[PDB]
Amino acid sequence: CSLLVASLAGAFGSSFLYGYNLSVVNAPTPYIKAFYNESWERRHGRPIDPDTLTLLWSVTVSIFAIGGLVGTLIVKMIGKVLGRKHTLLANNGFAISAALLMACSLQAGAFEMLIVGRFIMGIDGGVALSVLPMYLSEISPKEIRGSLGQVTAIFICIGVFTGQLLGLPELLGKESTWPYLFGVIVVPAVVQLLSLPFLPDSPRYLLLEKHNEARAVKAFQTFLGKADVSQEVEEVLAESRVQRSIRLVSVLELLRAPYVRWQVVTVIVTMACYQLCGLNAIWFYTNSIFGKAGIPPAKIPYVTLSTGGIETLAAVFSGLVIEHLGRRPLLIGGFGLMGLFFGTLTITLTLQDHAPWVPYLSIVGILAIIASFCSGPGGIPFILTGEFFQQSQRPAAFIIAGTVNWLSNFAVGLLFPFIQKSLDTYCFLVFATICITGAIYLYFVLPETKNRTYAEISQAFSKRNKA
Ligand SMILES: O=c1cc(-c2ccc(O)cc2)oc2cc(O)cc(O)c12
């Protein structure tokens, strides 16, 4: 009851918006480009030559990455005081401000407004996904935590799906309706503001430093559905004592430490390959990719909808495949299948003219690419990242992984149009090479981590640390 309500509310407040804004920029792309052309003609009197327009569009699409980067560093200062629930409500405030700055951008005719709104709502994204997971884990019993991890994954997926859905030409794709594309964001924010504050805070947050015994006890009683929660309180107090008995280590000291150099290189490379694979690239430029494959323009939005649907279905299937296959074989198989399907995509795009039914092969290839992603390395890199380190929840680790995550997303978003401009019919070879290289590296380096203690994996890594 209360558990499910809180889970749905938090996910809808943060991860749903992140997924929506991940793939809401593709459907109105031609209209926004026309707006850029018109605004520049008004302001300067000279039309934009196409490469400058493509660069401006790339900046607009990819500045979300820098927004998320600065979010995943402002969260460190915010969470020390604002907690979890109030942090999510402030996140809601960013969402309101950013959505309103989006909606009024067209009529005012100042694209600077759109850029600043994108940056703010990117800060929203980085504050969202670094506060939601801890809250979701903390408000749930031990036996269900993995289920809520799959819940946040599924809500990100459904946010992407509904973003690809609302971009349909009939609903919110017309020339007189596209501003409502960044005006829908108000509703999830409003419902989150109306739902979340009527729930108890994070009990762990209330007991680690707030020391609110009665409030924490009430929160455990409400969330766990039982009045016998003293054992959990004692367990979390013991965990707090253990953590306070261990000295914290800084990011710079962690980097200078020789016994975790291989671990940090592994996590950095895993994040770089998980975000340079190009799934976010397709999510941003699905319309352009499917148009360049020879599919008639009359059906591209529907095929994009199919992409979103299969991506959500792959998430649902992964939610159970993960618990039974593993981590290292799953990651290696996912990246290798990414490479092979990128090869079949380029062999079906290079010779699209030979037969009429080749674009259908392109669609099937993209289908399988997204399925292999979302059922494979789609979610594990966010668990394995903690799993490497001995502490297993290192803020330095989550600072050194998120930085590379957001910078790689920035690189992909700002360079994919130019990659296409260079390699119209081969632009997926670069992503295929990246994916295969990542697969090779993590096959020769990363050892299996399921049902393994941190001591054994530390021993295996030290076997290569030469120390
Ligand atoms: O927890 C996360 C989950 C996802 C994700 C995105 C798409 C999927 O089909 C499954 C998971 O991306 C992320 C990207 C980030 O930069 C940070 C995350 O925590 C996540």
UniProtKB/Swiss-Prot annotation:
Gene3D superfamilies in UniProt: MFS general substrate transporter like domains
One Gene Ontology cellular component: plasma membrane
Extracellular side: 20-54, 109-118, 169-178, 285-301, 350-362, 420-425
Outcome of mutating residue 229 to I: No effect on urate transport activity
Protein name: Solute carrier family 2, facilitated glucose transporter member 9
Segments passing through the bilayer: 1-19, 55-75, 88-108, 119-139, 148-168, 179-199, 264-284, 302-322, 329-349, 363-383, 399-419, 426-446
Alphabetical list of CDD domains matching this protein: MFS_GLUT_Class2
Effect on the protein upon substituting residue 327 to W: In RHUC2; markedly reduced urate transport activity; decreased Vmax; no effect on protein expression; no effect on glucose transport
Outcome reported for the amino acid change (mutating residue 241 to H): No effect on urate transport activity; no effect on protein expression; no effect on glucose transport
Effect in UniProt of substituting residue 163 to R: In RHUC2; decreased protein expression; decreased urate uptake; no effect on glucose transport
Similarity remark: Belongs to the major facilitator superfamily. Sugar transporter (TC 2.A.1.1) family. Glucose transporter subfamily.
Keyword check for Membrane: yes
rRNA-binding listed as a keyword: no
Consequence of substituting residue 104 to V: No effect on fructose transport. Increased urate binding affinity and decreased urate transport capacity
A molecular function (GO) term: carbohydrate:proton symporter activity
Catalytic function, reaction form: urate(out) = urate(in)
